[model samples]
Target: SVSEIQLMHNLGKHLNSMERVEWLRKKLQDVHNFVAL
Candidate 1:
């Protein structure tokens, strides 16, 4: 779990903050829609 969290944290550091948030929001919506199916 710690390694996964650290990996995400490192990955986030390479991304633009606003763009990353928007991308994650859309991804979350897509995941919700997929799960709803």
Candidate 2:
């Protein structure tokens, strides 16, 4: 599952530098909601 880990790592990096805190919060919330399903 190296690819999966790498993909998540890249996603984390992307979200980490998203420029706006609110945008990052919304993005993370969306991801959390999606995962919760």
Q: What tens digits encode model 1's per-residue C-alpha lDDT throughout 4-25?
A: 5564656653567797888687
Off by over 4 Å in 1: 1-15, 32-37
lDDT for model 1, on a 0 to 1 scale?
0.67
Worst 10 residues of 2 by lDDT: 11-20
Best by lDDT: 1
Question: What tens-digit string does per-residue lDDT give for candidate 2 at 1-37?
Answer: 4565664656543455445576666678787575534
Q: What TM-score would every model get versus the actual structure?
A: 0.36, 0.27
Provide backbone clash counts, one per model. 0, 0
Predicted structure 2: clash tally: 0
Once all C-alphas are superposed, what RMSD does model 1 give against the true structure? 6.0
lDDT score of residue 34 within candidate 1: 54
